[PDB]
Amino acid sequence: VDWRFFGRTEPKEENKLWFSDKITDAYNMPQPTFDFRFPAGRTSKEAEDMMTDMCVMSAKIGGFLPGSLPQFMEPGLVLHLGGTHRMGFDEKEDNCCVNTDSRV
Amino acid sequence: NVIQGQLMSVSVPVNTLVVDTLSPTSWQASTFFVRNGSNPEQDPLRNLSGQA
Amino acid sequence: KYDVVIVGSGPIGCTYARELVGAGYKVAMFDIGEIDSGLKIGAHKKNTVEYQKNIDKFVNVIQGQLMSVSVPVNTLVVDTLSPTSWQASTFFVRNGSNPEQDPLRNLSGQAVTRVVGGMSTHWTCATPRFDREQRPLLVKDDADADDAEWDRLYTKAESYFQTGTDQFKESIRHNLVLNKLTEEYKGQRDFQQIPLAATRRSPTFVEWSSANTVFDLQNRPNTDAPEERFNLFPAVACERVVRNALNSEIESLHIHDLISGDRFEIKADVYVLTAGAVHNTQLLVNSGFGQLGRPNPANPPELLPSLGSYITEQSLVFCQTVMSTELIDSVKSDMTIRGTPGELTYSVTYTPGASTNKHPDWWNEKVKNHMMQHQEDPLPIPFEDPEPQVTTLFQPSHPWHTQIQRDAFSYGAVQQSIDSRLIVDWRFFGRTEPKEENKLWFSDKITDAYNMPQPTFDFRFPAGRTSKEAEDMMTDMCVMSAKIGGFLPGSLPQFMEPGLVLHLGGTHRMGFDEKEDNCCVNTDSRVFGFKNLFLGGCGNIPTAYGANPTLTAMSLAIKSCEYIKQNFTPSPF
Amino acid sequence: KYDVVIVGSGPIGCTYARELVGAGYKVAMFDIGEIDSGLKIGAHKKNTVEYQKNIDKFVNVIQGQLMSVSVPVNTLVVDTLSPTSWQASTFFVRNGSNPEQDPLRNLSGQAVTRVVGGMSTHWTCATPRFDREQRPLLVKDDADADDAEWDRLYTKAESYFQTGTDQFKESIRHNLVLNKLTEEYKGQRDFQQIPLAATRRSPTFVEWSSANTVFDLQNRPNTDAPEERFNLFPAVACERVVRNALNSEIESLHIHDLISGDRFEIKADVYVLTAGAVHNTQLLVNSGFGQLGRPNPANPPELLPSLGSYITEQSLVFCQTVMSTELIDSVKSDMTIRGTPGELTYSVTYTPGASTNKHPDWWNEKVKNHMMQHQEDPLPIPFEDPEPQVTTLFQPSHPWHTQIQRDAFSYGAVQQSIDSRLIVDWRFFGRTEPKEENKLWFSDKITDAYNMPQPTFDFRFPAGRTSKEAEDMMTDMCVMSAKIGGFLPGSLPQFMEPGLVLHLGGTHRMGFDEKEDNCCVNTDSRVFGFKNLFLGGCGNIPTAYGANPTLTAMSLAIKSCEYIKQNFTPSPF
Numbered sequence A: 001v002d003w004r005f006f007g008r009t010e011p012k013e014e015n016k017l018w019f020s021d022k023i024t025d026a027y028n029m030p031q032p033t034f035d036f037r038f039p040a041g042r043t044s045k046e047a048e049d050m051m052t053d054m055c056v057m058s059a060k061i062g063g064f065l066p067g068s069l070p071q072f073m074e075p076g077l078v079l080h081l082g083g084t085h086r087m088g089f090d091e092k093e094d095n096c097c098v099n100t101d102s103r104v
Numbered sequence B: 001n002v003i004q005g006q007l008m009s010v011s012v013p014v015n016t017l018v019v020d021t022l023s024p025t026s027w028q029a030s031t032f033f034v035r036n037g038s039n040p041e042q043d044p045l046r047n048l049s050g051q052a
Numbered sequence C, D: 001k002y003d004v005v006i007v008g009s010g011p012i013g014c015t016y017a018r019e020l021v022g023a024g025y026k027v028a029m030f031d032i033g034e035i036d037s038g039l040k041i042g043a044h045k046k047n048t049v050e051y052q053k054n055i056d057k058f059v060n061v062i063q064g065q066l067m068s069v070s071v072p073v074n075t076l077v078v079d080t081l082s083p084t085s086w087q088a089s090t091f092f093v094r095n096g097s098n099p100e101q102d103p104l105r106n107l108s109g110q111a112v113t114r115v116v117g118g119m120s121t122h123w124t125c126a127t128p129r130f131d132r133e134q135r136p137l138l139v140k141d142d143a144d145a146d147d148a149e150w151d152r153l154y155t156k157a158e159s160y161f162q163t164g165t166d167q168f169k170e171s172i173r174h175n176l177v178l179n180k181l182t183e184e185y186k187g188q189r190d191f192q193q194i195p196l197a198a199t200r201r202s203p204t205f206v207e208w209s210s211a212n213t214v215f216d217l218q219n220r221p222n223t224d225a226p227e228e229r230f231n232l233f234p235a236v237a238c239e240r241v242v243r244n245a246l247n248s249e250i251e252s253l254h255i256h257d258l259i260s261g262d263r264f265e266i267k268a269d270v271y272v273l274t275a276g277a278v279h280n281t282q283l284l285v286n287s288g289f290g291q292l293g294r295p296n297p298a299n300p301p302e303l304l305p306s307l308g309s310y311i312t313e314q315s316l317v318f319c320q321t322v323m324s325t326e327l328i329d330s331v332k333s334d335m336t337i338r339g340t341p342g343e344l345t346y347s348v349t350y351t352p353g354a355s356t357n358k359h360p361d362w363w364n365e366k367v368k369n370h371m372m373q374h375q376e377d378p379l380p381i382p383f384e385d386p387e388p389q390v391t392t393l394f395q396p397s398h399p400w401h402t403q404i405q406r407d408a409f410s411y412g413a414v415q416q417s418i419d420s421r422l423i424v425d426w427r428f429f430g431r432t433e434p435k436e437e438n439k440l441w442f443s444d445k446i447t448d449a450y451n452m453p454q455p456t457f458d459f460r461f462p463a464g465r466t467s468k469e470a471e472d473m474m475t476d477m478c479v480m481s482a483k484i485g486g487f488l489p490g491s492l493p494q495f496m497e498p499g500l501v502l503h504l505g506g507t508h509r510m511g512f513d514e515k516e517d518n519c520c521v522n523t524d525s526r527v528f529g530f531k532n533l534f535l536g537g538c539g540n541i542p543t544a545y546g547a548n549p550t551l552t553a554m555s556l557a558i559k560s561c562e563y564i565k566q567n568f569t570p571s572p573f
């Protein structure tokens, strides 16, 4: 049995996806670059509490499989990236890019 | 394998792993230079290395 | 001819030596292994200046002297050989494997050490007492008297080992870990330093105890002990104790000198076997106790039917953690920190004696000095900080022993990327119910490297409580360790191979009545029916225990020595 | 105050001790390391009965005492940590790494051993002579006289080491390998047993030589040597030799007692440094020879400008093979074999003395007995067969040393599937041209675990001949080994990490003229300009060599002792 537990990440202004003005990708487009750390506070506290929850819960079904012991996966392997062009009611007030009609 | 076959990494930092078991006749650079499609802008410690 | 012969120069044999040499007996001691620890015979191998400056190297020394007890026949397929290479058509018995061994009913991790001083040349030195729930009875039907007997014996044992609980009191990391854990358990689990057989000599050097601490193993008489009589004979395999016909006395010991190759017999009044849990059993079975060969429930042994049954070994779980931001920041919580490290304006200061300080001035001085003198280093932990040595001892509500430390460890290339000061080891040790079906037996056909009957395990962790607790123990380590930091990749929470822990007991177990308690020795460690044969070691322990057993084994050995002293007279000098 | 002080108790220090104690000098010897080899001080650690019954365990003992010289700063990314774990924002200097070390210009495999007896406590004991093409000149402009000098010195060195070439003559596997290789090379390469410093005591036990063989390291005078004077002082770090102003004499040696922590100075007439290739250099640079810090071509050292330059280390390639069907079948070529193993009609017979037999009766007896008494075993090789010990020595046409053996090896789980009798190790060792740009230097800021200037390598294998030969050497091992069997998966042909081989030379090299030969010592191993300072060890070797260097180092040390004997008078007893 596989266990995958997925945590929530607070949006923080310092967490960015930006694009190189010099370097390009395979399609000659500006090369994507991440400036990302999991926020301190709630996000990190919950992530570790989440790991513990999976250890506790999974023990009810059986022991860990060697070679697949409890672990954090590499950041962004999960592919659930959001907030790169985020929605809100007011551009300035909600620090966002699109409205609730997804209109820029 | 099908999943792995179509996930292309977004930003790969410059690799700095030391391989010092090469033959003396093999060419080797004196630095860990930007290679193999790595992104030289990418700080390896502030990445989403798994993003694809 | 001697008064007493002791087989094995481990810390339990040395306990007998210490007591009986001191009492004026003419003692001989034999060990199959050799003197290979320095001029302090049987001393701890980690007590060199060079090891304590390169501590992770010591794991190699441990590995170098753990020889696997029973290896099953290997059936791994290698089909990438060249076509010209020879290959058998079957997975035949090879490379010292034991063909009697079922690979799925083994203690694959069980190993033995054959060197003077035994495993005490390399052990971790943790010497906790067993609480009542883990401990065999020495007095029946009076718990107070039983507690008093145990307290007196353990106190003497702690004396011999030089057990202390204060040698790591000035470690920042020790404190950091202990102080956090004790805050998080609501007063319902107590955390202390692991009781350690060790004496600190300086802030960077600890003299770990060993067999040598217990008894120095020098031949006597000598200048320091002109009226004592002791000889030690290394590289002598003890092969057989010779039973009389009535099974009431041992009459000699057969030995094989490994150097000359000659075989002798040695006469003593008293024979003590302290060859370890595995090798005590083997020597007994080779002498006609229990039985050789696959055991049959139809045909039980007539002599010591319980020998080699009810064996126990602990479940062991392990991980490492990387210390949390919260804890690293707390190290420096009392400091005012201004500027950027390495720049002209950088400073780290504290106010001595301030009441709002979390830490005493000794801590703050060390941290401030480290931070100001090593501005290239981003951690507040000083460089020669002693390692954490933390436990919460076994209790009914958490019936497992715990050790939270930073022991010698061979980090992989990627783990070595993590600063060692951040790394904490977790080892949790479970207790195993004694079950008659769990056995150590010996082949009637196959022999080991010393031409002795080959040991074979028939072991599974008992169903019920033992297995339920082991898994609850794994969970406890996941929960507890999360309070200090996340898991270190490559050292994620795992069960270790059965018997890697080396806390095997019950192979020649103690009780009040041979039949009623299904046992082999009485509370004097005397073999039932025999006037003059005693066994010492963890194999005597008949109970389900989680804590490290050597101190308890030693305590039983002191009691056994008292019996010998009360009943056998030393020969005249 | 002593006549002679020797720094280091390795086999080269013991050579000086042997010669000079014997000649009647009052000798002191210091070693930073401790006595930890048994009561035979400085003896080979593989000389226990237990290791020779469990030989693959000995690799752990070697690993346990090789401390890396210079480790670069690690920059491996671990990004699978929990978010609560502390992490630095940079790959900062940690875990004892050397921040001066360029990771791409290192000898990452270089390590040192600090124990009494040095590396001779664990070495492989191969003691070949160097042919002319590898060997420094002791006499200029007369090759015959040079050859005579070398023959006399090597002969004495072989005596001290107890070097032999016959101790493995009855190994089936030795023969199987040697006899095949010599048939396949058309008479143009000669194969012999590796000359080994060792004395066989029985068919399953070899007493490997060490420093102890050379000099027993017991204090004198003693009962065996009432008129000799020697003291050995372990756990003493030798820190500095004190130069006079004219750089013509050493005036004292500063020492640090590691146990008490006190620092002393010791006066002698003669100072000999035998602390190894790395640590001789370090002790000299700490005493003001050469220079501390990153070297500058602008600003060369005024004292011993060649110290720490022209360093050489060998290229080393390795694989293992699994013995071919052709060779395994040849073992039993003289046998008539009828029936199926384990069945009533199975038999294996030969005709003694038959002329058409390929093998002598001693071989055929062993094989027939093995095959008939172990019918469960599919191989014709007896179980306690000694290991192969085969070489073809360096020659102009194949300028690399070779060793074809079966040494201690920690096989992975899958390799352990292959019967050990089938497995053969290949190690080929190349020669490295001395180049001025190849350096060992010492940090002016960073210190090692003993508070001494931190060693740093600036090394690449020279372009040209050295690199061309190394790759030709790899190819030679692929070609040669294929004659015996295919490669063992997990041990495929590979270059080992630079300096793992531990045959570093040229760090304080010998020659006739300091300026002309770019060197540090003369052919008496005397430091140029100094009346009373001598260096011993592989660091003296100035040439490109492939063969194992210790015997050659020892030969130079005997010559140095002769000079000391001719020029310094022992003090009166």
Ligand SMILES: *Cc1cc2c(cc1C)nc1c(=O)[nH]c(=O)nc-1n2C[C@H](O)[C@H](O)[C@H](O)COP(=O)(O)OP(=O)(O)OC[C@H]1O[C@@H](n2cnc3c(N)ncnc32)[C@H](O)[C@@H]1O
Pocket (backbone or CB within 6 Å): C007, C008, C009, C010, C011, C012, C013, C030, C031, C032, C033, C062, C113, C114, C115, C116, C117, C118, C119, C120, C122, C123, C124, C125, C126, C127, C236, C237, C238, C239, C274, C275, C276, C277, C279, C280, C283, C502, C536, C537, C538, C548, C549, C550, C551, C553
């Ligand atoms: C391996 C080790 C063990 C250890 C541990 C960590 C490791 C890496 N840490 C421990 C700790 O923190 N606390 C604790 O209580 N125990 C720890 N251990 C285990 C401990 O070392 C053993 O429990 C203890 O050493 C047992 O003592 P004992 O004296 O009973 O047995 P021994 O040390 O194994 O020595 C027995 C000897 O007798 C010899 N021998 C064996 N067979 C023969 C024969 N046939 N003839 C003559 N002599 C024999 C051995 O060679 C040996 O020295």
Ligand SMILES: *Cc1cc2c(cc1C)nc1c(=O)[nH]c(=O)nc-1n2C[C@H](O)[C@H](O)[C@H](O)COP(=O)(O)OP(=O)(O)OC[C@H]1O[C@@H](n2cnc3c(N)ncnc32)[C@H](O)[C@@H]1O
Pocket (backbone or CB within 6 Å): D007, D008, D009, D010, D011, D012, D013, D030, D031, D032, D033, D062, D113, D114, D115, D116, D117, D118, D119, D120, D122, D123, D124, D125, D126, D127, D236, D237, D238, D239, D274, D275, D276, D277, D279, D280, D283, D502, D536, D537, D538, D548, D549, D550, D551, D553
């Ligand atoms: C590691 C080993 C080495 C070895 C080998 C296999 C391995 C696994 N096999 C070899 C073989 O088959 N043939 C051969 O010729 N060499 C082999 N080697 C290498 C060999 O062991 C060395 O070449 C030899 O031991 C060198 O001898 P030497 O006497 O020059 O040096 P040493 O053995 O390193 O001992 C030097 C000692 O001095 C000490 N020390 C170091 N620093 C100090 C200071 N500051 N003060 C006082 N003492 C110092 C050491 O502790 C040491 O014992």
